[PDB]
Amino acid sequence: RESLVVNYEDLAAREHVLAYFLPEAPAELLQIFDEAALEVVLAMYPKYDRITNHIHVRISHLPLVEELRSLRQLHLNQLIRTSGVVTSCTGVLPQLSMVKYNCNKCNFVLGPFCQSQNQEVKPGSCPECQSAGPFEVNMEETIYQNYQRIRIQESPGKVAAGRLPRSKDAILLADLVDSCKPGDEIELTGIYHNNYDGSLNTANGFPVFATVILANHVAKKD
Amino acid sequence: VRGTPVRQRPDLGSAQKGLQVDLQSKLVIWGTDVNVAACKENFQRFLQRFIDPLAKEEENVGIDITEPLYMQRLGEINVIGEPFLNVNCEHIKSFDKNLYRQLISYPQEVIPTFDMAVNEIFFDRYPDSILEHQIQVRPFNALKTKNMRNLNPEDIDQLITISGMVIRTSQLIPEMQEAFFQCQVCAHTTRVEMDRGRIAEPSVCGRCHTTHSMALIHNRSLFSDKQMIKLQESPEDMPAGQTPHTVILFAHNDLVDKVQPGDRVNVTGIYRAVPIRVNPRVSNVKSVYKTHIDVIHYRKTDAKRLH
Amino acid sequence: LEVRDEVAEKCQKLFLDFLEEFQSSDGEIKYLQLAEELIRPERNTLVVSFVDLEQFNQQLSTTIQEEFYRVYPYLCRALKTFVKDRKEIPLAKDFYVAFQDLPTRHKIRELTSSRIGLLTRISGQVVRTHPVHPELVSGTFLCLDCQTVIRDVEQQFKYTQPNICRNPVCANRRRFLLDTNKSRFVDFQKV
Ligand SMILES: [Zn+2]
Ligand SMILES: [Zn+2]
Ligand SMILES: [Zn+2]
């Protein structure tokens, strides 16, 4: 399954320092937890390295539940828990994870670079010919992680008075994909992302940032 | 073989592919007719069954005439400890003309087979001897080339013997033989031996898998010795109008500093033609090649001079 | 995991023991008394007798003689620790180990390639002596493609730039900028 579900209540009860740090710097804490969980899983099943070589630690039962209308710049780069209704959901898309590049000047293969979720990974020079010239993605040598984009809007029941339902975009990565369908009522825990490529720098208007949520744990309500 | 290291022989030049071709649709080397197996067997036969009939005790000192000459030479080698066996190309010619011709025309291939044969014999016998390296066979006394400027290009890369006077000898040139690379990240070390005159650098660490982190440490490598001998040829066939000839020789790892200026020698070595770069800083080479001799054997003995 | 040169580290430990235990006829620590003088500036070499080394530990002396080049930096670090744990020499100061009284002497004609990298002693007549220039022993370069600092790259008797930028996604192998104020130098003369 590649995913280990940690209860935030249990984590807080046992080690409160980790619980307090998790909602403040979730990216580093999640990476550390993934590494530690991979170490423990390999210790238990040393043969399991050939299946996944990576363990995703899904947090659960976060105390504070924020509704989409209450997400502000304060909650940027933090682990948040919200509830909503999946309105649209793209197919499963192969996103680059460890990308190898072909240098189409000498055919060398620039080795794997971790494709982060913020910026495109643009190699520098080819180590052999030192040519910064054009590169291509070697799709045979590359390894991809499943990618899905969903939209979740405030549930009509929760929407009150004459206010419109606010919607947000969420990103599912290689284990949360196909965990929801359009119309499903879900609870989503993830990082309130801000900085990938969206700042409206095209002078089209004011310098606002299109925010997305990197889903860390999805719990359907049924 | 007794596990003793097989020393590389720069005097034979950079190795080749050693490609083998079957002459039927027997198993010669590409471009030659040496048949390493047959050559090695024939050389073992020569080494174990050669008796010089018209030899003289004065000519051969410390050698039992009736007993096989080169077997006695191997005994001397075992006694002393110098793994060099000097073999007479005239003896080879007398024993088997075809073997002599093959040695002359294909030295870089035939000689290592002779090394293998000699080591096999010498370790089948004297099985407990200790030597810093395997035996190296040095042929000499090839059919004398009267004038070195009668050599045509069809005589390139083959064994010849010339007589000359040593005019100059250069300092020692350290020739690399085994590059020692070390990673600058994890300090993992590897060694790459000369393939064909080129050292294929690691380009990626075998320990941390970092690319182009392996730096070549120069003073932790294995080096050879080379010397340049400027020798004024002393031909005995001098045609009308021809002037004195100066030739370049290269000595490798044991013949270095074995001849001083003023010494008259008979040098046996490989006639090598090499390209010349138009500039020191470019890889273009003139279509005309300059020749030089890679020395295999010095001979300081002459019948018409003192000692 | 920064592969260890076990032979060299063993040599370093043995040489430090030799420094801190070896004694003269009087019975005191002669090399402690000598290293007492290394604290002063413009004084960064300790002279050690190969005879004393051989007496104290024949195996250590033979190892040093037969692998002098590879082990020499470790001997220098051993001397640095020996001086530091006694006195308050500047942290950045380097120390060198000179050897003398080597029993055997070779000839410049006998200085073949087989003698490369291993301790030797020769006799010569000085023809001319060049001036005293600072020499680069280890420089810290800056990458001109990503401003990554590649630190402590050794110089092998030649101006050597980093073979590759540390940044995995940057294959800069040409455009480096030496940082003189961060590099270390040693006195140098060619005679
Ligand atoms: Zn390239
Ligand atoms: Zn490495
Ligand atoms: Zn760089």
XYZ file of C-alpha atoms and ligand atoms in Angstrom:
723
model
C 0.000 0.000 0.000
C 3.036 2.340 0.389
C 1.088 4.543 2.841
C 1.144 4.468 6.641
C -1.674 6.324 8.402
C -0.633 8.070 11.623
C -3.306 9.328 14.002
C -2.523 12.902 14.996
C -4.201 12.317 18.361
C -1.830 9.429 19.073
C 1.169 11.432 17.872
C 0.242 14.359 20.123
C -0.371 12.094 23.118
C 2.974 10.319 22.734
C 5.307 13.081 21.471
C 3.744 16.535 21.724
C 6.765 18.288 20.186
C 6.298 16.519 16.854
C 2.560 17.208 16.956
C 3.187 20.913 17.539
C 5.822 21.114 14.793
C 3.791 19.209 12.192
C 1.187 21.941 11.448
C 3.936 24.600 11.231
C 6.492 23.077 8.820
C 4.586 20.117 7.370
C 6.870 19.625 4.357
C 10.057 18.899 6.309
C 8.213 16.944 8.997
C 6.509 14.790 6.364
C 9.804 14.127 4.581
C 11.456 13.158 7.876
C 8.531 10.912 8.798
C 8.647 9.269 5.371
C 12.362 8.541 5.732
C 11.947 7.157 9.256
C 8.958 5.031 8.246
C 10.904 3.665 5.284
C 13.766 2.748 7.614
C 11.425 0.961 10.030
C 9.545 -0.809 7.230
C 12.805 -2.019 5.694
C 13.949 -3.231 9.111
C 10.734 -5.225 9.532
C 10.710 -6.510 5.921
C 14.175 -6.006 4.391
C 12.751 -7.516 1.201
C 10.193 -4.692 0.891
C 12.705 -2.245 -0.618
C 12.011 -3.649 -4.096
C 8.286 -2.794 -3.926
C 8.075 0.906 -3.043
C 11.399 2.304 -1.715
C 9.282 5.130 -0.250
C 6.607 5.377 2.448
C 4.015 8.158 2.642
C 2.972 9.117 6.176
C -0.666 10.232 6.031
C -1.703 12.300 9.040
C -5.245 11.824 10.312
C -7.701 13.381 12.760
C -6.131 16.820 12.782
C -7.841 18.814 15.562
C -8.748 22.022 13.729
C -11.046 21.713 10.710
C -11.015 24.812 8.498
C -13.747 25.461 5.946
C -12.739 26.620 2.484
C -14.166 30.103 3.048
C -11.880 30.626 6.069
C -8.577 29.905 4.291
C -6.394 33.027 4.411
C -2.760 33.948 3.853
C -2.235 33.111 7.534
C -2.735 29.407 6.770
C -0.131 29.419 3.984
C 2.506 26.679 4.205
C 0.707 24.791 6.960
C -1.109 21.490 7.364
C -4.857 22.139 7.340
C -7.963 19.961 7.509
C -11.088 20.911 5.561
C -14.272 19.296 4.272
C -15.897 19.614 0.891
C -17.529 18.072 -2.156
C -15.430 16.940 -5.108
C -16.865 18.844 -8.067
C -14.354 17.886 -10.774
C -11.497 15.391 -10.874
C -8.954 14.982 -13.659
C -7.712 11.619 -14.847
C -4.551 10.069 -13.418
C -1.635 11.923 -15.010
C 1.980 10.655 -15.029
C 4.028 13.379 -13.358
C 7.814 13.351 -13.411
C 9.323 12.169 -10.119
C 12.962 11.191 -10.817
C 13.614 12.513 -14.311
C 16.522 11.443 -16.500
C 17.477 13.745 -19.366
C 18.899 12.964 -22.786
C 21.466 15.490 -23.979
C 20.713 15.601 -27.698
C 24.220 16.813 -28.538
C 26.173 13.764 -27.364
C 23.326 11.449 -26.197
C 24.564 11.408 -22.599
C 21.945 10.715 -19.926
C 21.896 13.316 -17.170
C 20.984 11.408 -14.052
C 17.864 11.598 -11.925
C 16.750 14.926 -10.486
C 13.962 15.114 -7.914
C 11.016 16.774 -9.669
C 9.671 18.977 -6.896
C 6.077 20.205 -6.840
C 7.107 23.885 -6.958
C 9.302 24.506 -10.015
C 10.243 22.741 -13.216
C 13.590 20.957 -12.954
C 15.829 22.530 -15.598
C 19.264 20.874 -15.911
C 22.379 22.961 -16.341
C 25.221 21.668 -18.495
C 25.733 18.158 -19.770
C 28.477 16.656 -17.568
C 30.206 15.127 -20.593
C 30.061 17.785 -23.321
C 29.339 20.691 -20.928
C 26.754 21.959 -23.421
C 23.891 23.883 -21.836
C 22.027 23.292 -25.071
C 18.680 21.586 -25.548
C 17.775 18.624 -23.361
C 14.958 16.101 -23.645
C 13.180 13.968 -21.059
C 14.279 10.336 -21.367
C 10.910 8.713 -20.793
C 12.271 5.159 -20.589
C 14.788 5.963 -17.842
C 12.455 8.346 -15.999
C 10.117 7.207 -13.220
C 6.764 8.952 -12.807
C 4.312 9.357 -9.942
C 0.573 9.391 -10.567
C -0.861 12.911 -10.436
C -4.486 13.982 -10.093
C -6.099 17.406 -9.728
C -9.462 17.722 -7.983
C -11.735 20.627 -7.112
C -13.599 20.636 -3.793
C -16.271 23.211 -2.976
C -17.985 24.037 0.289
C -20.944 21.745 0.820
C -24.285 23.475 0.124
C -25.519 22.638 3.613
C -22.530 24.366 5.190
C -22.920 27.347 2.855
C -25.086 29.788 4.797
C -27.171 32.934 4.229
C -26.688 34.130 0.621
C -22.994 33.320 0.343
C -21.534 31.515 -2.640
C -19.752 28.140 -2.310
C -15.987 28.608 -2.415
C -13.923 26.009 -4.270
C -10.271 25.009 -4.005
C -7.895 22.892 -6.064
C -6.159 19.894 -4.512
C -3.327 17.699 -5.763
C -3.222 13.921 -5.246
C 0.146 12.162 -5.598
C 0.548 8.471 -6.389
C -1.525 7.085 -3.518
C -4.467 9.474 -3.035
C -5.323 9.266 -6.744
C -8.711 7.713 -7.552
C -9.538 7.920 -3.837
C -12.427 10.271 -4.675
C -14.933 10.829 -7.469
C -16.991 13.852 -8.533
C -19.792 14.402 -6.046
C -18.139 12.537 -3.179
C -18.160 14.299 0.179
C -14.632 14.167 1.587
C -12.410 15.510 4.330
C -9.045 16.648 2.985
C -5.851 17.182 4.978
C -2.947 18.822 3.217
C -0.514 21.690 2.867
C -1.999 25.055 1.887
C 0.480 25.541 -0.937
C 1.250 28.987 -2.337
C 4.436 28.893 -4.412
C 4.617 26.738 -7.535
C 4.326 29.040 -10.573
C 1.210 31.157 -10.018
C 1.581 34.836 -9.193
C -0.187 36.591 -12.106
C 3.071 38.202 -13.211
C 1.675 38.755 -16.728
C 0.502 42.257 -15.683
C -3.057 41.008 -16.223
C -3.954 42.671 -12.924
C -3.086 42.636 -9.251
C -0.247 40.430 -7.934
C -2.353 37.677 -6.387
C -1.237 34.075 -5.929
C -3.299 31.087 -7.052
C -3.173 28.755 -4.054
C -3.512 24.969 -4.192
C -3.696 22.251 -1.532
C -1.210 19.372 -1.623
C -3.481 16.621 -0.333
C -1.866 14.555 2.412
C -4.838 12.448 3.556
C -8.334 11.981 2.115
C -11.219 10.539 4.145
C -14.511 9.988 2.347
C -17.742 10.428 4.314
C -19.944 7.403 3.646
C 52.923 -19.007 -14.138
C 53.317 -19.087 -10.346
C 51.192 -16.051 -9.518
C 54.102 -13.729 -10.261
C 52.886 -10.479 -11.876
C 53.138 -10.168 -15.653
C 54.943 -6.868 -16.172
C 53.713 -4.634 -18.974
C 56.270 -4.212 -21.774
C 56.225 -0.651 -23.161
C 58.958 -1.606 -25.639
C 56.299 -3.612 -27.497
C 54.053 -0.543 -27.672
C 50.408 -0.191 -26.787
C 48.503 -3.451 -27.072
C 46.105 -4.129 -29.943
C 42.720 -5.822 -30.199
C 44.409 -9.173 -30.730
C 41.525 -10.055 -33.031
C 41.535 -13.644 -34.290
C 40.546 -14.700 -37.813
C 39.808 -18.217 -39.047
C 41.347 -18.793 -42.480
C 38.791 -21.486 -43.381
C 35.038 -21.620 -43.938
C 43.765 -22.037 -39.138
C 43.151 -19.515 -36.355
C 45.638 -16.759 -37.162
C 45.727 -13.267 -35.679
C 44.160 -10.569 -37.828
C 46.733 -9.359 -40.337
C 49.346 -11.989 -39.433
C 49.868 -15.762 -39.526
C 51.289 -16.282 -36.045
C 48.799 -18.709 -34.424
C 49.711 -17.914 -30.817
C 49.288 -21.546 -29.746
C 51.533 -22.966 -32.474
C 54.056 -20.159 -31.988
C 54.243 -20.790 -28.235
C 54.638 -24.540 -28.716
C 57.353 -24.050 -31.336
C 59.240 -21.612 -29.113
C 59.077 -24.026 -26.183
C 60.453 -26.698 -28.515
C 63.293 -24.391 -29.573
C 64.063 -23.415 -25.983
C 64.172 -27.030 -24.781
C 65.867 -28.600 -27.826
C 68.392 -26.117 -29.269
C 72.069 -27.090 -29.460
C 74.530 -24.863 -31.307
C 76.644 -27.335 -33.323
C 79.594 -25.128 -34.332
C 79.577 -23.219 -31.037
C 82.839 -22.490 -29.233
C 83.710 -22.620 -25.548
C 85.401 -19.235 -25.924
C 82.170 -17.818 -27.353
C 80.019 -19.418 -24.626
C 81.382 -18.818 -21.113
C 79.927 -20.571 -18.088
C 77.621 -22.680 -20.271
C 77.720 -26.450 -20.697
C 77.831 -26.838 -24.475
C 76.127 -30.237 -24.621
C 73.287 -29.186 -22.313
C 70.545 -27.020 -23.868
C 71.853 -23.470 -24.025
C 68.682 -21.619 -23.074
C 67.815 -24.139 -20.367
C 71.193 -23.288 -18.851
C 70.237 -19.633 -19.305
C 67.052 -20.283 -17.322
C 69.144 -21.912 -14.612
C 71.313 -18.800 -14.489
C 68.172 -16.658 -14.260
C 66.929 -18.732 -11.330
C 70.315 -18.369 -9.631
C 70.565 -14.601 -10.130
C 67.053 -13.149 -10.107
C 66.976 -10.935 -13.208
C 63.915 -12.001 -15.278
C 65.464 -11.225 -18.673
C 66.238 -13.992 -21.174
C 68.426 -12.864 -24.075
C 67.731 -15.032 -27.135
C 69.649 -15.018 -30.415
C 67.583 -14.487 -33.546
C 70.310 -16.340 -35.444
C 69.732 -19.349 -33.193
C 66.004 -19.032 -33.868
C 66.694 -18.857 -37.611
C 68.903 -21.948 -37.482
C 66.359 -23.944 -35.479
C 63.300 -22.963 -37.542
C 63.359 -20.367 -40.314
C 59.589 -19.828 -40.287
C 59.575 -19.004 -36.573
C 62.402 -16.522 -37.142
C 60.461 -14.857 -39.956
C 57.310 -14.649 -37.839
C 59.252 -13.114 -34.952
C 60.903 -10.576 -37.253
C 57.765 -9.485 -39.091
C 55.350 -9.605 -36.106
C 57.308 -8.776 -32.937
C 54.516 -7.123 -30.955
C 52.515 -10.367 -31.226
C 55.188 -13.078 -31.289
C 57.309 -11.809 -28.384
C 54.613 -12.065 -25.659
C 54.003 -15.662 -26.745
C 57.718 -16.240 -26.171
C 57.332 -14.671 -22.724
C 54.484 -17.073 -21.960
C 56.474 -20.070 -23.204
C 59.572 -19.136 -21.211
C 57.578 -18.570 -18.026
C 55.771 -21.887 -18.483
C 59.071 -23.743 -18.847
C 60.769 -21.824 -16.034
C 57.962 -22.474 -13.536
C 57.346 -26.071 -14.582
C 60.980 -26.309 -13.567
C 62.370 -24.353 -10.599
C 58.783 -24.181 -9.278
C 59.813 -22.406 -6.048
C 61.822 -19.526 -7.535
C 60.944 -15.956 -6.542
C 61.028 -13.178 -9.141
C 59.767 -9.605 -8.995
C 58.050 -10.238 -12.343
C 57.698 -12.813 -15.091
C 60.524 -13.440 -17.550
C 60.852 -11.134 -20.554
C 62.467 -12.513 -23.709
C 64.774 -10.145 -25.601
C 65.621 -11.230 -29.160
C 68.695 -9.806 -30.847
C 71.232 -10.392 -33.617
C 68.554 -10.146 -36.283
C 69.719 -10.142 -39.887
C 71.784 -6.959 -39.857
C 70.242 -4.023 -41.709
C 73.265 -2.522 -43.439
C 71.817 0.980 -43.918
C 68.801 2.118 -41.911
C 67.687 4.379 -44.780
C 67.122 1.353 -47.012
C 64.092 0.569 -44.822
C 60.848 0.911 -46.765
C 57.478 1.647 -45.133
C 56.610 -2.025 -45.648
C 59.233 -2.696 -42.940
C 57.430 -0.667 -40.260
C 56.516 -2.129 -36.866
C 58.908 -5.055 -37.158
C 62.144 -6.182 -35.546
C 65.449 -4.863 -36.901
C 69.046 -4.658 -35.713
C 71.278 -1.658 -36.411
C 74.799 -0.619 -35.459
C 75.458 2.896 -34.249
C 77.167 5.290 -31.874
C 75.326 6.833 -28.934
C 75.373 10.611 -29.354
C 73.013 11.629 -26.551
C 70.717 10.187 -23.891
C 67.820 12.147 -22.432
C 66.608 12.335 -18.850
C 64.045 9.841 -17.561
C 60.461 10.273 -18.773
C 57.873 8.910 -16.299
C 55.366 6.939 -18.385
C 52.036 6.320 -16.671
C 50.791 2.733 -16.479
C 47.907 2.713 -13.958
C 45.964 5.867 -13.139
C 44.752 6.091 -9.540
C 41.432 7.926 -9.285
C 39.829 9.053 -6.035
C 36.375 10.495 -5.443
C 36.390 14.020 -4.040
C 33.121 13.340 -2.167
C 33.427 9.892 -0.548
C 37.155 9.228 -1.193
C 36.435 5.894 -2.893
C 39.531 4.934 -4.883
C 39.907 2.968 -8.113
C 42.689 2.153 -10.566
C 42.556 2.112 -14.373
C 45.341 0.495 -16.379
C 46.511 1.717 -19.775
C 44.111 0.182 -22.278
C 45.652 1.123 -25.639
C 47.571 4.214 -24.616
C 44.398 5.781 -23.199
C 43.156 5.845 -19.608
C 39.354 5.692 -19.565
C 38.561 7.794 -16.517
C 35.780 6.607 -14.179
C 33.346 9.473 -14.955
C 31.116 8.202 -12.103
C 31.893 7.026 -8.587
C 31.252 3.365 -7.865
C 30.666 4.113 -4.173
C 28.386 7.172 -3.938
C 27.330 7.172 -7.623
C 28.262 10.837 -8.045
C 29.051 11.811 -11.631
C 32.486 13.195 -12.534
C 33.725 13.293 -8.949
C 36.758 11.030 -9.510
C 39.975 13.061 -9.715
C 43.189 11.460 -10.972
C 45.858 11.545 -8.260
C 49.107 11.787 -10.196
C 51.626 10.668 -7.572
C 49.620 7.628 -6.419
C 49.677 6.045 -9.889
C 52.001 3.435 -11.387
C 54.682 4.769 -13.723
C 57.271 3.388 -16.122
C 60.640 4.725 -17.272
C 61.413 5.975 -20.769
C 64.587 7.411 -22.262
C 65.358 8.948 -25.650
C 68.641 7.850 -27.233
C 69.962 9.980 -30.087
C 72.223 7.503 -31.886
C 74.280 8.298 -34.985
C 73.952 5.277 -37.248
C 77.221 3.632 -38.318
C 76.131 1.870 -41.518
C 78.489 -0.471 -43.335
C 76.733 0.036 -46.697
C 77.358 3.657 -47.709
C 76.168 4.633 -51.209
C 77.582 7.565 -53.131
C 76.732 10.950 -51.659
C 74.789 9.737 -48.621
C 75.561 11.571 -45.386
C 75.681 10.363 -41.772
C 72.343 9.370 -40.259
C 70.989 10.185 -36.799
C 68.142 8.048 -35.452
C 66.025 8.218 -32.305
C 65.677 5.255 -29.949
C 63.401 4.740 -26.948
C 64.411 2.517 -24.018
C 61.873 1.247 -21.487
C 62.139 0.505 -17.768
C 65.369 -1.507 -17.762
C 67.453 -0.375 -20.753
C 67.322 3.171 -19.378
C 70.833 4.467 -18.631
C 72.403 1.264 -19.990
C 74.325 3.157 -22.703
C 76.301 6.379 -22.288
C 77.320 8.874 -24.986
C 80.267 7.649 -27.018
C 79.240 3.988 -26.781
C 79.109 1.966 -29.990
C 76.180 -0.444 -29.802
C 74.124 -2.907 -31.788
C 70.507 -2.020 -31.014
C 67.730 -4.515 -31.718
C 64.270 -3.011 -31.647
C 60.967 -2.412 -33.372
C 60.941 -0.074 -36.372
C 58.131 2.319 -35.425
C 56.590 5.048 -37.578
C 54.556 7.641 -35.683
C 52.535 10.730 -36.677
C 53.780 14.246 -35.981
C 51.395 16.963 -34.852
C 51.571 20.115 -36.960
C 51.510 22.161 -33.745
C 52.011 21.176 -30.100
C 48.482 22.459 -29.405
C 46.503 20.713 -32.178
C 45.657 17.108 -33.001
C 46.196 17.418 -36.757
C 49.091 15.260 -37.954
C 51.219 15.607 -41.073
C 50.658 12.969 -43.739
C 54.397 12.168 -43.538
C 55.509 10.019 -40.604
C 58.797 10.178 -38.710
C 60.307 6.865 -37.644
C 62.159 5.802 -34.510
C 63.316 2.549 -32.921
C 61.778 1.073 -29.784
C 64.749 -0.701 -28.226
C 64.505 -4.326 -27.142
C 68.168 -5.298 -26.730
C 71.515 -3.545 -26.410
C 74.598 -5.432 -27.601
C 77.964 -3.940 -26.647
C 79.971 -6.767 -28.253
C 81.848 -6.257 -31.521
C 84.358 -8.609 -33.125
C 86.635 -5.842 -34.481
C 87.014 -3.734 -31.319
C 88.406 -4.090 -27.812
C 86.164 -4.800 -24.812
C 30.767 7.372 3.992
C 34.094 9.108 3.321
C 36.063 5.898 2.821
C 38.945 5.715 5.293
C 42.593 5.185 4.357
C 43.149 2.606 7.074
C 46.887 2.219 6.452
C 47.396 5.977 6.648
C 45.260 6.345 9.782
C 47.178 3.539 11.484
C 50.402 5.293 10.502
C 49.052 8.557 11.929
C 48.144 6.941 15.248
C 51.496 5.162 15.519
C 53.392 8.345 14.648
C 51.468 10.365 17.233
C 52.318 7.695 19.801
C 55.965 7.933 18.734
C 55.898 11.707 19.187
C 54.207 11.570 22.592
C 56.157 8.611 24.024
C 59.620 8.565 22.442
C 62.371 9.772 24.769
C 66.080 10.507 24.479
C 68.906 9.219 26.680
C 67.985 11.759 29.363
C 64.544 10.117 29.427
C 62.459 13.222 28.706
C 60.212 13.761 25.678
C 62.633 15.247 23.158
C 59.936 15.844 20.558
C 57.730 17.480 23.183
C 60.614 19.864 23.845
C 61.014 20.433 20.102
C 57.296 21.018 19.501
C 57.449 23.567 22.321
C 59.176 25.797 19.748
C 56.465 25.287 17.101
C 54.100 27.670 18.920
C 56.020 30.720 17.727
C 54.899 32.114 14.350
C 57.128 31.756 11.269
C 57.827 28.272 12.653
C 55.687 25.451 11.279
C 57.936 22.408 10.733
C 59.151 19.743 13.151
C 62.356 17.864 12.346
C 62.278 14.162 13.237
C 65.139 11.674 13.006
C 64.418 8.614 10.892
C 66.900 6.812 13.150
C 64.725 7.622 16.162
C 61.599 6.550 14.283
C 63.163 3.235 13.255
C 64.360 2.580 16.805
C 60.954 3.294 18.331
C 58.961 1.275 15.782
C 60.596 -0.446 12.818
C 57.257 -1.242 11.182
C 56.150 2.392 11.356
C 59.433 3.570 9.841
C 59.228 1.037 7.012
C 55.605 1.973 6.323
C 56.502 5.666 6.183
C 59.487 5.028 3.923
C 57.539 2.823 1.509
C 54.326 4.909 1.444
C 55.635 8.370 2.295
C 53.546 10.380 -0.167
C 50.137 8.971 0.754
C 50.793 9.002 4.508
C 52.589 12.359 4.775
C 49.400 14.462 5.183
C 48.286 12.157 7.984
C 51.654 12.585 9.702
C 51.205 16.350 9.422
C 47.739 16.109 10.978
C 49.154 13.935 13.764
C 51.775 16.589 14.486
C 49.052 19.245 14.428
C 47.064 17.362 17.068
C 50.236 16.827 19.101
C 50.948 20.563 19.127
C 47.321 21.565 19.723
C 46.596 19.370 22.730
C 49.652 20.963 24.389
C 49.469 24.637 23.355
C 47.169 27.271 21.817
C 48.465 27.518 18.237
C 46.041 29.220 15.806
C 43.334 26.885 14.553
C 44.173 27.576 10.900
C 47.915 26.977 11.324
C 49.417 24.060 9.403
C 52.343 21.916 10.522
C 54.850 19.922 8.493
C 57.112 16.997 9.347
C 60.682 17.061 8.068
C 62.702 13.844 8.225
C 66.487 13.657 8.481
C 69.298 11.156 9.008
C 67.742 8.728 6.546
C 70.258 5.842 6.519
C 70.300 5.256 2.751
C 71.176 7.745 0.015
C 70.260 7.350 -3.653
C 71.745 8.745 -6.854
C 69.964 11.133 -9.202
C 70.558 8.492 -11.871
C 68.825 5.953 -9.604
C 65.821 8.229 -9.019
C 63.657 6.073 -11.291
C 59.863 5.953 -11.438
C 59.842 3.101 -8.916
C 60.990 5.700 -6.366
C 57.904 7.847 -7.020
C 55.975 8.768 -3.899
C 58.240 6.985 -1.401
C 60.780 8.576 0.907
C 64.311 9.020 -0.415
C 67.450 11.089 0.080
C 69.784 12.393 -2.623
C 72.891 14.564 -2.874
C 73.124 17.408 -5.366
C 74.845 20.663 -6.226
C 72.543 23.683 -6.247
C 72.599 25.398 -9.643
C 70.127 28.220 -8.998
C 67.359 29.049 -6.538
C 64.119 30.768 -7.525
C 62.326 33.252 -5.240
C 59.833 32.504 -2.459
C 56.274 32.670 -3.819
C 53.106 31.630 -1.984
C 51.697 28.439 -3.480
C 48.103 27.244 -3.620
C 47.603 24.020 -1.659
C 43.803 23.998 -1.318
C 41.478 26.658 -2.722
C 37.753 27.259 -2.264
C 36.099 27.963 -5.616
C 32.792 29.604 -6.499
C 30.604 28.238 -9.286
C 29.697 30.898 -11.844
C 26.560 29.010 -12.933
C 24.844 28.574 -9.549
C 27.065 30.372 -6.982
C 27.757 27.119 -5.118
C 30.943 27.131 -3.047
C 33.164 24.092 -3.635
C 35.440 24.060 -0.607
C 38.900 22.584 -0.002
C 39.917 21.244 -3.411
C 43.550 20.150 -3.369
C 46.168 21.333 -5.864
C 48.362 18.597 -7.354
C 51.339 20.768 -8.267
C 49.077 22.457 -10.816
C 46.135 24.842 -10.819
C 43.280 22.359 -10.395
C 39.676 23.530 -10.481
C 36.863 21.401 -9.050
C 36.232 18.484 -11.380
C 32.473 19.094 -11.093
C 30.186 21.495 -9.277
C 28.768 20.027 -6.078
C 25.200 20.929 -7.048
C 23.888 17.708 -8.655
C 21.781 19.642 -11.160
C 24.659 21.774 -12.391
C 27.420 20.194 -14.483
C 29.663 23.262 -14.432
C 33.190 22.042 -15.142
C 34.705 25.244 -16.589
C 33.371 28.437 -14.998
C 34.823 28.573 -11.487
C 36.152 31.553 -9.524
C 38.921 31.016 -6.984
C 38.409 32.628 -3.570
C 41.871 33.773 -2.503
C 40.762 35.024 0.915
C 39.374 31.538 1.642
C 42.183 29.495 0.074
C 45.252 28.348 2.010
C 48.835 28.850 0.850
C 52.251 27.440 1.698
C 55.713 28.853 1.130
C 57.290 27.522 -2.043
C 60.697 27.615 -3.706
C 62.009 25.820 -6.786
C 65.753 25.112 -6.812
Zn 26.094 16.286 -23.713
Zn 32.320 8.850 -4.341
Zn 27.247 24.978 -10.105
